[PDB]
Amino acid sequence: MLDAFTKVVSQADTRGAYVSDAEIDALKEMVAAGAKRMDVVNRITGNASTIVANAARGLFAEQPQLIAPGGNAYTNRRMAACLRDMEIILRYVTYAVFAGDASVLDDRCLNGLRETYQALGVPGASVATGVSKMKEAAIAIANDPNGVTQGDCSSLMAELGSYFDRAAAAVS
Amino acid sequence: MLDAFTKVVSQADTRGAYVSDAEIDALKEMVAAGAKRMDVVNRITGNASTIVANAARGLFAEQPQLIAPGGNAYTNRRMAACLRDMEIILRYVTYAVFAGDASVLDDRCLNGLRETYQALGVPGASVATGVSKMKEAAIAIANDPNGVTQGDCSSLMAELGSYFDRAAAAVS
Amino acid sequence: MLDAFTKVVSQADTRGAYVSDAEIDALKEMVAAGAKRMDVVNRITGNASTIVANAARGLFAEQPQLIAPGGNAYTNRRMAACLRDMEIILRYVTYAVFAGDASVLDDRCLNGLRETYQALGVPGASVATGVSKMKEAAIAIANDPNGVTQGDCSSLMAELGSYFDRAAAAVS
Amino acid sequence: MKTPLTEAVATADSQGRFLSSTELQVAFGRFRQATASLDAAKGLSSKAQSLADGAANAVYQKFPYTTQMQGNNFASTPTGKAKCARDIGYYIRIITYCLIAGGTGPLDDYLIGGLAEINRTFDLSPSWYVEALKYIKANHGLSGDPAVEANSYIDYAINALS
Amino acid sequence: MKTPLTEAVATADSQGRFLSSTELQVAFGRFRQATASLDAAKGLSSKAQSLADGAANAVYQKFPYTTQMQGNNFASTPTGKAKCARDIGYYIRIITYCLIAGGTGPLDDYLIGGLAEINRTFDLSPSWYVEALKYIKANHGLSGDPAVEANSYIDYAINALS
Amino acid sequence: MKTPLTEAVATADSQGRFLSSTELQVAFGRFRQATASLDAAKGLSSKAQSLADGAANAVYQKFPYTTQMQGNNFASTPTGKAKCARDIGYYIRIITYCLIAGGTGPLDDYLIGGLAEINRTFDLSPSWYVEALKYIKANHGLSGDPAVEANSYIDYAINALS
Numbered sequence A, B, C: 001m002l003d004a005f006t007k008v009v010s011q012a013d014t015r016g017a018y019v020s021d022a023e024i025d026a027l028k029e030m031v032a033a034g035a036k037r038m039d040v041v042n043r044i045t046g047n048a049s050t051i052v053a054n055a056a057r058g059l060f061a062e063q064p065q066l067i068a069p070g071g072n073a074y075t076n077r078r079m080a081a082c083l084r085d086m087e088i089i090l091r092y093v094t095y096a097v098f099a100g101d102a103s104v105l106d107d108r109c110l111n112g113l114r115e116t117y118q119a120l121g122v123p124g125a126s127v128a129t130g131v132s133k134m135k136e137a138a139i140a141i142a143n144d145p146n147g148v149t150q151g152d153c154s155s156l157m158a159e160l161g162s163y164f165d166r167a168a169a170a171v172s
Numbered sequence D, E, F: 001m002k003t004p005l006t007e008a009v010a011t012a013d014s015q016g017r018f019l020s021s022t023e024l025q026v027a028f029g030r031f032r033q034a035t036a037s038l039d040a041a042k043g044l045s046s047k048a049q050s051l052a053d054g055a056a057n058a059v060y061q062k063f064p065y066t067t068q069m070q071g072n073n074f075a076s077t078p079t080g081k082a083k084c085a086r087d088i089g090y091y092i093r094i095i096t097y098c099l100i101a102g103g104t105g106p107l108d109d110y111l112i113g114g115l116a117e118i119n120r121t122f123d124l125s126p127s128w129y130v131e132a133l134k135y136i137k138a139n140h141g142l143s144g145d146p147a148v149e150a151n152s153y154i155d156y157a158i159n160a161l162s
C-alpha cells in the first residue's frame, strides 16, 4: 500500500524525477493538519458500531425489500454478513484517512468486490446506499464541534467523503 | 444440502409463509413410504459394483471407440478413472434418494462437471450414456420383487430415474 | 513429461501400434550422439550466469525504454525478476535438450506464460528478444570447438535453437 | 440445513462412502418421529397469530418500559410494535419449520446464526424474546410427543438467547 | 512417464536447479543400455503375433474352464477369445515400449495403474495373465543383455499381478 | 511501501482491527519528524547534480582501475561513465525519497531488493558504491536533525552493500 508521502514518491520515481518543491509544500500542509486527520480516524473508530447500525437502519427503512422474507438481508445470518461488510468498508476507509491515500482501500477491499457481489446476488446498488449512509453518519461524528479544539476540517471531511464515494462507486 | 422436508421449508421461508396443510400431507406420504425408500438406497448400495460394471460393459459394447487405443477409456488408469466417476455419480444419486432431494447431487457432484469434462476431453455424451445404463441396472436391482415385502414402488423408481436423468443432462 | 523415447512410445500407443523399425533407428541415432547432447547441457549449465547476463546486456542496449525510470525492468527488484525469468527459461531449455523433447518446457514453463505476462504488464515481445539473445549466447558456448573432441553438432544446435524459438513464440 | 437425513449424508460424504445400515436406521428413527412433529407443526400453524398477539402482550407486561421509553429499539411507537410482532412471528414460524425438518436446522440457519450480533447492533434485549418464548411454551396447547417436540425447539431458542 | 531421463529432470526441477554431473552420468548409463534394449524391442515386435497366439493357448491349457464356463469374463465365446488375445497383445506391446523407454513408465502408465481395480470390476483372474507372461518369458527367443532387459519388465508385470 | 503509516495499517489489518491509540501515536511521531526530513529532501535535491559529480570522481580516485580497465562493468568508456553517474544519481534520488517517506521503503523497494543479484550478474563492486555514499555523507552540507535523518538512510544503504 502507499500513504500520501509514498504516493508522491511513486509518481516521481515513474518519471525519474525529484519530488518538486510544490509537492513537498503540499505534504508539509498534510503534516501541519495531522492532529485533525487523527481525530477523524479516532472518532470514526470509537463510534464504528453506531455508524454501521445507523446506516443499516436508514438503508432498511428506504429499501424494506432487503429485510422482507426472500430479501438479501433477511435472516440473522444474512443481516450479520451485511453489517460485517459495512464494518469492513468503514475499517478500510479509516485506514485510507490515516494514510492519506486510497491504495489500501482499493487493493484490500474494493478490487474485485463488484464481481464478488454479482456472484453472491448481493445487490451492489443497495450496498452503495448503505455506504453513502455511513458517510453521512461518519462525517456527523467526525465533524462534531463538541469536545475538540475549534477549527476547520472541511478539506478532511471532503477527503473522507471521497473514500466513501470511491467505495460506493466500486460496488454499484 | 436440503432434504425433502427442508426443501419445502426453504421455499416457504422465501415467501415468509407457513408450510401448507397440502405440503405437510405430501411429506406425511413420503414418511409413510420411508421403508421402501430405504430399500432403494440399501439395494443400490449393496450392488454398487455390479451396477457400475454392467453399465460400463454396456457403454463399451455400444461405443467401442472409447476403449480402442487412443480412446478416452483406453489404458487401465483411464478405465479406472471412468469406473470411479460412475461410482461417484451412483453414490450421490443414492444420497439424493435417501434425502428425497437432488440438492446434494447438484451441489457436490453435477455443478461444474460439464466444464470439468470439457477441459479434460472426457466425452460428456458418453458419460450420459453410462449414467443411463446405470439407471436401468439400478432400477432392475432396486425394483426386484424377490426377498422384499410385495407392494408398489413406482413413484420411487420414477424419482430414482429422475436423479440419474438429471446427472445425464448435467454432463451432455 | 516425455523424453524423446517416450514421445515415440506415446504416439505409437495412441495408434495401438508397435514403434516402427525406422523410429527405433532414429532413436539409435540419438543414442549414438548422446555424448554431444550431454556436452550441450553441460556447457550451457556451467555458463548459465554468463548467458543470462550477456543476453540481458544486449536486450537493454536495444530496448533502453525497459531500464529507463518507469520501464518494466527499472529498479533492482524488477531487474532481478527479469534475470530470474531468463534463468528459468534457460533451465527448462537445458531440460528439453537433456530429454530430447520440449514437453517439460511446454508443461512446466511456457503453458500460460503469455497470459501471466499480459496480467503483470511484462512486455512479452521484449522477453522473446531476451530469449533470442540467450539462444545466440548459448549456441556460441555450446558449439565452441575449444576443449572438446572435434565433430559435428549442427543437428543438436538446431534442436537447441528450436527450444529457444518455442519459448520466444510462447511469450510474444 | 441440519436434519437427521442431511447429517447422515454429510457423514457418509465426508468419508467418501455409501450410506451404511446405521444411516438407514437414523432415517427410520426420523420417520417414526415425523408424523407427530408434522401434527405439532399443523397445531402451531393454526394458532400462530393468536400466539404472536399473546407473546407480544406478555413481553410488554413484563417489560412495560418497552412500550413507553423513546428509542429506535423500543415498541413505544406503531412501527416499533410492528417490528416486535414481526420478530415474535418469525420465532413461531421458524419453530414450526423445525417440527417439519425434524431438527434445529431452520432455527440455526434462519435465526440463531448472527442472533447475538443483531441483538447487540440494534440494542434488542434477549430477555424480551425469552419472555415471548416462555409464553409460546405455556400456550401452544399441544400435549404428548408433539408438545415434547415443540418444547425441545422452544428451549433450544431460549438457550440460544441466554 | 518414468524413464531414467525424465526421473533426472524431475529431480533437478524439484530442487529448482540445473542438471548436475550425476544426472548427465545417469543419461550416459541409459545410453549405454539403449542399443541392446532397442534390439530386444525389434526382436519382440517381429514375434508379437506368434507370442500372443502361444500365450493365449498356454492360459487356456492351464485354466481349461476359461474356454468352457459361460460368463462375460470368460473366453468361452468368440468375443471373449478376442478380448483375451487383445489383452495379451497389450502386455506384449507395452513391454516392447518399456525396452524403448529404458524403464517401467509405459507399463506403469498404460497397464499397471488401475490394473487391480479393472481385474476386480470385470472378474478377470490375475493368475490368467501371469501364465500368459511366463509363456512370453520362455518363448521370446532373446538371450544376453536383451533377454535380461525383457525378463526384468516381464517379472515386473508378473509382480504387479501377484 | 514501508513507512511508519503503512506499517501501522498493515499491523491493524493483519489483526482484522481498527487502528488503536498506539497507531495514532506512531502517526504523531512521524508527523513531528516530517518537516525537518522534508527540509533535508529539499536540501539534497538542490545539491543532487553537484553531489553525483563529486561522488563519481571520489569512486574514480579510490579505484583508478574503473577508468582504465576494459570491460562492460567499467567506467573506462563514455557509456560506462554515464552508467556510473546514472547509478550514483539513483542512490541520491532514492535517499531523498526516504526523507519524504519517513522510512526506508523507497530504498528497500527500488534499490536494495535485488541489489546483491544485480551487482553479481553485472560484476559491479559494492565497494564502488560504498565510496560514492561516504562522499555524499561528507558533502550533503546538512546539520542537526536533517543530517541525522539523511545519514541514517546513507548508512542503511552502505550496510546493504557490505
Ligand SMILES: *[C@@H](C)[C@H]1/C(=C/c2[nH]c(/C=C3N=C(/C=C4\NC(=O)C(CC)=C4C)C(C)=C\3CCC(=O)O)c(CCC(=O)O)c2C)NC(=O)[C@@H]1C
Residues within 6 Å of the ligand: A032, A033, A034, A035, A036, A037, A038, A039, A040, A042, A142, A143, A144, A145, A148, A149, A150, A151, A152, A153, A156, F021, F024, F025
Ligand atoms: C475536525 C476533525 C474537527 C476539529 C479538529 C481539530 N483538532 C485539533 C487539535 C488536536 N487534535 C488532536 C488529536 C488527538 N489527541 C489525542 O490524544 C489523540 C489520540 C492519540 C488524537 C487523535 C490533538 C493532539 C490536537 C492538539 C491538542 C488539542 O487537543 O488542541 C484542532 C486544532 C488544530 C491543530 O491541528 O492542532 C482541530 C481544528 N476541530 C473542529 O472544530 C472540527 C469539528
Ligand SMILES: *[C@@H](C)[C@H]1/C(=C/c2[nH]c(/C=C3N=C(/C=C4\NC(=O)C(CC)=C4C)C(C)=C\3CCC(=O)O)c(CCC(=O)O)c2C)NC(=O)[C@@H]1C
Residues within 6 Å of the ligand: B032, B033, B034, B035, B036, B037, B038, B039, B040, B042, B142, B143, B144, B145, B148, B149, B150, B151, B152, B153, B156, D021, D024, D025
Ligand atoms: C420397491 C422398492 C420394492 C418393495 C419395497 C417394500 N419394502 C417394504 C417394507 C420394508 N422395507 C424395509 C427396509 C429395510 N429393513 C431393514 O432392515 C433395512 C436396513 C436398515 C431396510 C432398508 C422394512 C423395515 C420394511 C418393513 C418390514 C418388512 O420387511 O416388511 C414394503 C412394504 C410396505 C412398507 O412401506 O412397509 C414394500 C412394498 N416391494 C416391492 O415389491 C418392490 C419391488
Ligand SMILES: *[C@@H](C)[C@H]1/C(=C/c2[nH]c(/C=C3N=C(/C=C4\NC(=O)C(CC)=C4C)C(C)=C\3CCC(=O)O)c(CCC(=O)O)c2C)NC(=O)[C@@H]1C
Residues within 6 Å of the ligand: C032, C033, C034, C035, C036, C037, C038, C039, C040, C042, C142, C143, C144, C145, C148, C149, C150, C151, C152, C153, C156, E021, E024, E025
Ligand atoms: C558440439 C556439442 C561440439 C562437440 C561435441 C562432441 N563431444 C564428443 C565426445 C564426448 N563428449 C563427452 C561428454 C562429457 N564427458 C563428461 O565427462 C561429461 C560430464 C558428465 C560430459 C557431458 C564425452 C564423454 C565424450 C567422449 C569422450 C571425449 O571427450 O572424446 C564428440 C565426439 C563424438 C562422440 O559422440 O563421442 C563430439 C563431436 N564437438 C565439437 O567440435 C562441437 C563444437
Ligand SMILES: *[C@H](C)[C@H]1/C(=C/c2[nH]c(/C=C3N=C(/C=C4\NC(=O)C(CC)=C4C)C(C)=C\3CCC(=O)O)c(CCC(=O)O)c2C)NC(=O)[C@@H]1C
Residues within 6 Å of the ligand: A057, A060, A067, A073, A074, A075, A076, A079, D059, D060, D066, D067, D072, D073, D074, D075, D076, D079, D080, D081, D083, D084, D085, D087, D088, D090, D091, D110, D111, D118, D122, D124, D128, D129, D132
Ligand atoms: C419485541 C420482542 C421487542 C422489539 C423489537 C424490535 N426489533 C427490531 C428490529 C430487528 N429485529 C430483527 C430480528 C430478526 N430479523 C431476522 O431476519 C430474524 C430471523 C428471521 C429476526 C429474529 C432484526 C434483524 C432487526 C433489525 C433490522 C430490521 O429493522 O428488521 C426493532 C427495530 C429496531 C431499530 O433500531 O429499528 C424493534 C423495535 N422492541 C421492543 O421494545 C419489543 C419488546
Ligand SMILES: *[C@H](C)[C@H]1/C(=C/c2[nH]c(/C=C3N=C(/C=C4\NC(=O)C(CC)=C4C)C(C)=C\3CCC(=O)O)c(CCC(=O)O)c2C)NC(=O)[C@@H]1C
Residues within 6 Å of the ligand: A066, A071, A072, A073, A078, A079, A081, A082, A083, A085, A086, A088, A089, A108, A109, A110, A113, A116, A120, A122, A123, A126, A127, A130
Ligand atoms: C449489506 C449492506 C448488504 C448485504 C451484504 C451481504 N454480504 C454477504 C457476503 C459476503 N460479503 C463479502 C465481502 C467481503 N469479504 C471480505 O473479506 C471483504 C474485504 C476484502 C469484503 C468486503 C464476502 C466475501 C461475502 C461472501 C462470504 C461471507 O459471507 O463471508 C452476504 C451473505 C450472502 C449469502 O448469501 O450468504 C450478505 C447478505 N446484503 C444486503 O442485502 C445489503 C445490501
Ligand SMILES: *[C@H](C)[C@H]1/C(=C/c2[nH]c(/C=C3N=C(/C=C4\NC(=O)C(CC)=C4C)C(C)=C\3CCC(=O)O)c(CCC(=O)O)c2C)NC(=O)[C@@H]1C
Residues within 6 Å of the ligand: B057, B060, B067, B073, B074, B075, B076, B079, E059, E060, E066, E067, E072, E073, E074, E075, E076, E079, E080, E081, E083, E084, E085, E087, E088, E090, E091, E110, E111, E118, E122, E124, E128, E129, E132
Ligand atoms: C485372457 C487372459 C482372459 C480373458 C480376458 C478378458 N478381458 C476382458 C476385458 C477387459 N480386459 C481389460 C484389460 C485392459 N484394458 C486396457 O486398457 C489394458 C491396458 C492397455 C488392459 C490390459 C479391460 C479394461 C477389460 C474390460 C473393458 C473391455 O471390455 O475392454 C474380457 C471381457 C470381460 C467383460 O466383462 O466384458 C475378457 C473375456 N478372459 C478369459 O477367460 C481369458 C483366459
Ligand SMILES: *[C@H](C)[C@H]1/C(=C/c2[nH]c(/C=C3N=C(/C=C4\NC(=O)C(CC)=C4C)C(C)=C\3CCC(=O)O)c(CCC(=O)O)c2C)NC(=O)[C@@H]1C
Residues within 6 Å of the ligand: B066, B071, B072, B073, B078, B079, B081, B082, B083, B085, B086, B088, B089, B108, B109, B110, B113, B116, B120, B122, B123, B126, B127, B130
Ligand atoms: C466413464 C464413463 C467416462 C470417462 C471418465 C474419465 N474421467 C476422468 C477424470 C476425472 N473425472 C472427474 C470427476 C469427478 N471428480 C470428483 O471428485 C467428482 C465429484 C464431485 C467427479 C464427478 C475428475 C475431477 C477427473 C479428473 C481428475 C482425476 O482423474 O481424478 C478420466 C481421466 C482423464 C485423463 O485424461 O486422465 C476419465 C477417463 N472416460 C470415458 O471415456 C467414459 C465416457
Ligand SMILES: *[C@H](C)[C@H]1/C(=C/c2[nH]c(/C=C3N=C(/C=C4\NC(=O)C(CC)=C4C)C(C)=C\3CCC(=O)O)c(CCC(=O)O)c2C)NC(=O)[C@@H]1C
Residues within 6 Å of the ligand: C057, C060, C067, C073, C074, C075, C076, C079, F059, F060, F066, F067, F072, F073, F074, F075, F076, F079, F080, F081, F083, F084, F085, F087, F088, F090, F091, F110, F111, F118, F122, F124, F128, F129, F132
Ligand atoms: C559506478 C559506481 C561504477 C560503474 C557502474 C556501472 N553500472 C552498470 C550497470 C547497471 N547498474 C545498475 C544499477 C541500478 N539499476 C536500477 O534500476 C537501480 C535502482 C533504481 C540501480 C542502482 C543496473 C541494474 C545495471 C545493469 C543494467 C543496466 O545497464 O542498466 C554498468 C554497465 C554494466 C554492463 O555490463 O553493461 C556500469 C559500468 N562501473 C564502474 O566502473 C564505476 C566505478
Ligand SMILES: *[C@H](C)[C@H]1/C(=C/c2[nH]c(/C=C3N=C(/C=C4\NC(=O)C(CC)=C4C)C(C)=C\3CCC(=O)O)c(CCC(=O)O)c2C)NC(=O)[C@@H]1C
Residues within 6 Å of the ligand: C066, C071, C072, C073, C078, C079, C081, C082, C083, C085, C086, C088, C089, C108, C109, C110, C113, C116, C120, C122, C123, C126, C127, C130
Ligand atoms: C526480463 C527479460 C523481462 C521482465 C521480466 C519480469 N518478470 C516479472 C515477474 C514474473 N515472472 C514470472 C515468471 C515465471 N514464474 C515461474 O515460476 C515461471 C516458471 C513456470 C516463470 C517463467 C512470474 C510468475 C512473475 C510474477 C511473480 C514474481 O515476480 O515472482 C517481473 C516483475 C513484475 C512486477 O511488476 O513485479 C519482471 C520485471 N521484465 C522486462 O522488462 C523484461 C522484458
